[PDB]
Write a protein that binds this ligand. Structure first.
Ligand SMILES: Nc1ncnc2c1ncn2[C@@H]1O[C@H](COP(=O)(O)OP(=O)(O)O)[C@@H](O)[C@H]1O
Ligand SMILES: [Mg+2]
Lengths: 512, 170
């Protein structure tokens, strides 16, 4: 076996372990754990001089270079005109079959199963990075330029791996090839690309020695295909159950809402979580530069922009215009920054609800940016946007990083004397006690001028609305208590609440 | 009676109603109305958690792939790299004439009227979508991606149809 082989070259043998969690804290060890049937990891407790532990990937041996060239060329010669299917499984099925035909009649330097591993690894997956992708104990992967691949391991922290890139052009080719597999090719014109690998891991590419002077570089950040849910956000303290119940009520009624803040404040995460509040039987069109939103609704159009360096380039603006003809109930724009913002408000003015993330720390800044170049939403249409929430990163007393929705504003008007926004802060934040404050009872213009009127409830039975709100807050609190945190489970519980009512829903989930 | 054929696989018995207006707005229902001679619609409420009720298309049975393929081949032959005229109604007329000419002495697994329906439906109209286009109670039709065709119905609101697209290429 390829593994046992490797061991025999060693000065002294490492102990086989199920996983590195046992090695935690320790520092006198020597171990090999299994990842795939094709990937074993050898971890060495002896630091390098620069304090890196060594992460050694054990893979089966590769065929010769000339063998590989012969195979690729034959593979290319077969089928070479036909395009492969889009479906990843059907694609791999086809490739393995074709490969099996070519190899059958060949005399290989290494076993067939090994040629197959490496061919598939390089052609369909992430090549020499694939073992790192497959190890669940890897958090982050970095190729900073020529040299080793560095990782952050959940047990050992930063480690130097046995994988090396010693050639500029080979490194360029890796970045080009991986970005193409991530559906968003780099180019010299647009050498910086954020995207996701097929497994869902986030990847950042920086292409070309003219920008990344030690060679093209990349960073992979692993993390769930399952998006963070609204119950997790409540448990984190990012928003209260009442705040979530409020948003839930508003999305039930088609309100337009922007999630605002600075970069990495968590805006996209919050937008994705609250999307689960959009009623299930509605049409959702998402428009993004790269996919991040994981919408659970069935009627979901997911559109992504494209840069070609010429004809065929499609921007958020173009997609948003097309959405006016796609009968969506909600349009979710990944981020609004340029003239697509103007079209977002056109969408609102034509009866489509909209959510987006936006870069602004407060309502004053949000309105200045919406109404100014290059967005130029006219002032009298600004109140089509109903709600702006503002989210920020902070440190607590201990120094731990936290993210908090620090204000939720209802947009009422722009005052003609003179050009200041009229708004109501429905929620605010006390940074000292780390608590969310509600305005609250009989403070919301949206509850008591839009929803109450639709309902159509009188100003003296308005308690009925605030009671439904307090109700939704209890149900959410209950989900948190019972540790219903998974995105799709939370979605199911929300749909369940739609389909038997709150009163019946709270009382159910109280049992477990 | 391709409708009766469809009906009999059904455990429950859809009421025939000829007009779905009389169901607005009932949360329980299992009925059938006619759209035209070749299209009946079976609508049904279920306990779906995402709030989509069922809109099932009832069309005549298709001829086999081999039957259809033979027909398309002969049709191509009968044209002989001649471009259609430029009118459109005179087109369908010419196409239906050629069809009769070709099906005249063929033996098909399904009635010849059904062969013509499907053939004309895929060649001239919108294929599997055509019943939805023909149904006057449908406002929106969406194929958002792989999965079901979704519609918005004047009586029932958004519904999930029985029509499915599960292959990227097609
Ligand atoms: N409420 C939260 N609590 C903790 N971490 C969060 C929260 N929201 C987002 N994150 C994490 O913070 C980082 C930035 O999140 P993201 O939603 O992309 O922010 P933005 O969209 O503002 O750039 C990501 O790693 C994400 O997993
Ligand atoms: Mg974001």
């Amino acid at each position: 076996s390829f593994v046992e082989d490797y061991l025999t070259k060693l000065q002294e043998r490492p102990t086989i372990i199920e996983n590195p969690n046992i090695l935690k804290g320790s520092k006198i060890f020597n171990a090999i754990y299994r990842v795939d049937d094709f990937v074993y990891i050898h971890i060495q407790s002896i630091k390098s001089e620069d304090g890196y532990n060594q992460y050694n990937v054990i893979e089966p041996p590769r065929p010769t270079h000339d063998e590989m060239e012969e195979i690729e060329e034959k593979f290319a010669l077969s089928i070479g005109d036909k395009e492969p299917p889009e479906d990843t499984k059907e694609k791999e099925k086809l490739i393995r079959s074709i490969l099996d035909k070519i190899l059958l009649r060949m005399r290989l330097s290494v076993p067939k199963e090994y040629v197959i591993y490496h061919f598939i690894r390089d052609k369909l997956y992430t090549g020499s990075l694939e073992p790192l992708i497959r190890d669940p104990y890897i958090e982050d992967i970095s190729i900073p330029g020529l040299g080793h691949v560095y990782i952050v391991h959940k047990v050992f922290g930063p480690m130097r791996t046995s994988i090396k890139f010693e050639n500029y052009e080979e490194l360029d080719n890796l970045i080009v090839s991986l970005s193409e597999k991530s559906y968003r090719p780099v180019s010299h014109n647009r050498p910086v690309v954020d995207a996701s690998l097929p497994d869902g891991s986030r990847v950042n590419f920086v292409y070309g020695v003219d920008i990344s002077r030690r060679g093209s570089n990349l960073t992979v950040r692993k993390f769930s295909r399952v998006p963070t849910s609204i119950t997790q956000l409540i448990m984190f303290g990012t928003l209260s159950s009442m705040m979530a119940a409020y948003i839930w009520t508003m999305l039930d009624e088609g309100m337009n809402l922007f999630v605002c803040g600075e970069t990495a404040s968590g805006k996209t995460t919050t937008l994705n979580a609250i999307t689960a509040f959009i009623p299930p039987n509605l049409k959702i069109v998402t428009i993004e530069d790269t996919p991040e939103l994981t919408v659970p609704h069935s009627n979901w159009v997911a559109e992504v922009t494209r840069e070609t360096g010429g004809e065929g380039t499609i921007k958020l603006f173009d997609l948003l215009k097309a959405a006016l003809r796609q009968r969506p109930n909600y349009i979710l724009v990944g981020a609004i920054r340029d003239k697509e913002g103007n079209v977002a408000f056109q969408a609102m003015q034509t009866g489509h609800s909209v959510m987006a993330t936006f870069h602004a720390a407060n309502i004053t800044t949000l309105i200045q940016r919406l109404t100014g170049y290059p967005i130029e939403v006219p002032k009298s249409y600004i109140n089509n946007l109903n709600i702006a929430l503002f989210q920020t990163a902070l440190y607590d007393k201990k120094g731990n990083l936290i993210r908090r929705v620090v204000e939720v504003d209802e947009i009422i008007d722009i005052d003609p004397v003179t050009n200041d926004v009229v708004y109501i802060p429905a929620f605010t934040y006390d940074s000292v006690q780390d608590k969310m404050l509600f305005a609250g009872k009989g403070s919301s213009y949206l509850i008591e001028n839009k929803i109450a009127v639709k309902r159509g409830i009188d100003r003296r039975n308005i308690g009925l609305l605030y009671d439904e709100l307090q109700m939704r807050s209890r149900f959410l609190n209950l989900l948190v208590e019972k540790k219903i945190f998974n995105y799709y489970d939370v979605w199911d519980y929300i749909l369940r609440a739609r389909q038997m009512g709150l009163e019946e829903a709270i009382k159910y989930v109280s049992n477990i």
